[PDB]
């Protein structure tokens, strides 16, 4: 077969017009929040329509009267829920004539328009049609005979008290009978303009994605995974808009940064030296004057892989960073004695010989979580301990749980999407009720006299919900958490009981005052006139209180006598019988259940925080709020690999350190007396017999100064340069026994296998189609 990788490049000939019809006439789903694209979309449709009639993407005559009708109704359709018409009128036209508009290719508007329909007649104002649409949507009467609103206030808006006038097309749409959705409300009041009659909500506006390091992602194009970073601010995102710049910043506190930057923020790779203060997200107490961090930066944070070096203290850390703190695997060395001997006039070789062994013995490998070292709170043994705890249960519970695990999967495999949504809603409701179950049936009662009264508890509380945790939060178990100036490093030093009770009483009277203010401010408005639901209870979330109160009042003797006077002028049993039917239908008597319960409890349970793995990826019902304060600790090979890659990252990042003419280079490169020095970084001048450093033919003409350490350094630099070179230049005909040869062999094998698979698919298609 022909070699795909050895085609003769004698004649190169491409045929592609720059305004490419493949790339130009196309609408992307990536362009969703952009309004102008909508117009383009319609235009594109028109093009296709013309191609369907003339085949030239250009219309004879021009845009006709029926093109707008087609593009309005027939072109694109939107999802509705359900119609339910009727065939008989329920109103009378005996009132002032021309009150209701009449209602009896005539198929539709487009069919009539293409059959010679002028559509030129104009009549009536828009407000009448919008009011009629709202009235039919409500299925009520919103205006009386005189024309004054019946469901909204008709008096002029009081400028005092903060109220302002509101049009009907807004009030009758922001306040609706809950069987009308936002889309139908917008469609009823003729909201058509794309640019001015639409706004983006605070919680629904488009924002760039967050990908972090961007390692684990679904690749839309498998060959190039960088294509999936186009919607983020990742340093390697394609075409940011402004080129990444080699920033060399000196801050007023003498903190210096040198490396890649996006906009004006450090971004990509670089080296940062700390002066007074801090930077790169580090804590104020971590750094000193002269410490440095080399490695990856992201959004001004030391995020990724790097190395932190402190010349004053000697600590050296190599490894992973998240945000501005150590998070992941890391390796720690303490080279303090080496620096101590170096600063006291000892040559480096002698100091290394003296202090190599002690430093090598004290090398530490660790796993860090949010800047804290793990391994002291038995983080390593958590999983095994939890497995043993799960194994310590009674056999019946374990068997039932294991059967339920398979039953859930088998049930979910065959459910409909609507059934899945309902199931997830039920699960969410159950999870919520596991913390705050409503006091249904215990909100209102009747006293001895028969008067309805609220049902309080052993305290001054009507429901378990408190509005003070909204500003302070709640832990996983139920405790609140830190507050303003909470002090009490450990709460084993509690507050005095007298102060506690006094403050509790003061909080109770404050709650009473708050309730009084809320009532006197919001209780006058009416939300639901059928049940007397005011705005205060509606906005406090106590609608079920009113729902129970209505039934309690109507069932009371006083309520019954009032109803008589004005007239003068699931259940527990259902669940029980369903459970009994389920028990009977399976052939399991209650005696068997009692026997099994006795066997489990008296014979097994008497013989001798939810179950599961605390560190689990898939958890069915999660809530995305429970937080793990630990991670699987790195093993030695993983730490070694992390250090090996971090050293590569540091070496690659240390290439932005001495920009030729930059502020840091001009102001921080000094001799012994502190005066500036003329660094040999001229692009054309190589003085004092250093022309061997020229990376060209000129360098070969001159000789090296004959220093073994310099020769080793040059050899290492040459090795790095060759390693960089090999990644962009290949051989046309590789020799057998080399890596590139096996790569080419595998590529050819892949092509052959794909061709065979396609041939088999074609054979199957031919068999099916004939």
């Amino acid at each position: 077969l022909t070699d795909p990788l050895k085609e003769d490049p004698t004649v190169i000939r491409d045929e592609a017009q720059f305004p490419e019809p493949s790339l130009y006439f196309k609408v992307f789903e990536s362009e969703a929040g952009e309004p102008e694209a909508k117009i383009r979309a319609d235009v594109n449709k028109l093009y296709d329509r013309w191609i369907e009639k003339y085949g030239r993407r250009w219309p004879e005559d021009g845009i006709n009267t029926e093109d707008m009708v087609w593009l309005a109704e027939e072109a694109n359709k939107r999802k509705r829920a359900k119609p339910r018409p009727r065939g008989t009128v329920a109103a009378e036209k005996t009132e002032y004539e021309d009150e209701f508009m009449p209602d009896p290719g005539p198929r539709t508007n487009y069919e009539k328009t293409v059959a010679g329909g002028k559509w030129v007649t104009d009549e009536f104002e828009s407000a009448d049609y919008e009011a009629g649409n709202l009235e039919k949507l409500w299925d009520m009467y919103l205006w009386d005979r005189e024309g004054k609103p019946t469901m909204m206030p008709d008096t002029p808006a009081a400028q005092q008290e903060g109220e302002e006038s509101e049009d009907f097309d807004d009030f009758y749409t922001a306040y609706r009978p809950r069987d009308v959705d936002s889309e139908e409300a917008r469609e009823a009041v003729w909201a058509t303009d794309e640019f001015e009659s639409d706004e983006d909500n605070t919680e629904s506006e488009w924002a760039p994605e967050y990908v972090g390091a961007g390692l684990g992602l679904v690749a839309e194009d498998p060959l190039n995974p960088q294509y999936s970073l186009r919607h983020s601010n990742h340093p390697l995102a394609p075409f940011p808009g402004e080129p990444l710049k080699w920033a060399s910043y000196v801050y007023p506190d003498f903190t210096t940064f040198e490396g890649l930057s996006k906009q004006s923020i450090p971004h990509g790779m670089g080296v940062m030296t700390f002066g007074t203060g801090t930077g790169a997200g580090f804590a104020m107490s971590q750094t000193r004057y002269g410490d440095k961090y080399e490695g990856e930066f992201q959004a001004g944070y030391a995020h990724g892989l790097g190395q932190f070096t402190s010349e004053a203290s000697g600590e050296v850390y190599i490894g992973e960073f998240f945000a501005g703190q150590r998070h992941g695997c890391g390796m720690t060395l303490d080279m303090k004695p080496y620096f101590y001997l170096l600063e006291r006039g000892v040559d480096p070789v002698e100091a290394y010989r003296r202090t190599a062994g002690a430093i090598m013995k004290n090398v530490e490998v660790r796993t860090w979580y949010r800047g804290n070292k793990l391994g002291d709170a038995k983080e390593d043994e958590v999983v095994e301990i939890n497995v043993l705890k799960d194994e310590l249960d009674d056999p019946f519970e374990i068997a039932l749980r294991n059967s339920l695990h398979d039953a859930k999967l088998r049930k979910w495999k065959a459910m409909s999407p609507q059934d899945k949504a309902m199931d997830r809603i039920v699960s969410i409701i159950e999870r919520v009720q596991r913390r705050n179950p409503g006091r249904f049936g215990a909100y209102y009662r009747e006293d001895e006299k028969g008067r309805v009264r609220p049902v309080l508890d052993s305290d001054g509380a009507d429901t378990d919900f408190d509005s003070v945790d909204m500003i302070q939060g709640v832990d996983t178990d139920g405790d609140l958490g830190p507050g303003w100036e909470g002090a009490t490093d450990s709460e084993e030093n509690p507050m005095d009981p007298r102060i506690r009770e006094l403050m509790a009483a003061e909080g109770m009277d404050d709650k009473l005052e708050d309730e009084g203010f809320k009532d006197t401010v919001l209780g006058s408005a009416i939300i639901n006139p059928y049940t007397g639901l005011d705005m205060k209870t509606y906005l406090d979330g106590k609608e079920r209180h009113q729902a129970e109160l209505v039934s309690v009042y109507k069932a009371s003797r006083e309520g019954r006598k009032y109803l008589n006077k004005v007239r003068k002028d699931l259940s527990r049993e259902a669940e029980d019988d369903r459970l009994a039917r389920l028990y009977e239908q399976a052939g399991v008597s209650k005696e068997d259940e009692r026997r099994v319960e006795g066997l489990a409890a008296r014979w097994r349970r008497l013989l001798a925080r939810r179950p599961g793995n605390p560190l689990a990826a898939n958890d069915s019902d999660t809530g995305f709020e429970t937080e793990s304060d630990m991670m699987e600790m790195c093993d030695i090979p993983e730490i070694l690999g992390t250090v090996q890659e971090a050293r590569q990252i540091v070496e690659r990042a240390r290439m932005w350190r001495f920009k030729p003419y930059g502020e840091v280079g001009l102001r921080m490169a000094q001799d012994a007396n502190g005066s500036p020095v003329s660094l040999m970084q001229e692009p054309l001048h190589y003085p004092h017999g250093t022309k061997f450093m020229a990376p060209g033919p000129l360098g070969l003409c001159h000789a090296v100064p004959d220093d073994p350490s310099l020769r080793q350094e040059m050899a290492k630099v040459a090795h790095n340069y060759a390693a960089i070179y090999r990644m962009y230049n290949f051989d046309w005909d590789p020799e057998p026994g080399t890596v590139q040869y096996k790569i080419d062999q595998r590529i050819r094998r892949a092509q052959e296998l794909r061709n065979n698979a396609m041939a088999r698919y074609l054979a199957a298609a031919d068999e099916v189609l004939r």
Binding site: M335, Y352, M360, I636, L640, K716
Partner: peptide, 17 residues
């Protein structure tokens, strides 16, 4: 219990460990 620095030697000794 051609040219390499202290970190490489320590990593190699741990790898042998």
């Amino acid at each position: 219990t051609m040219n390499q620095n202290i970190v490489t030697e320590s990593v190699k000794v741990e790898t042998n460990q």
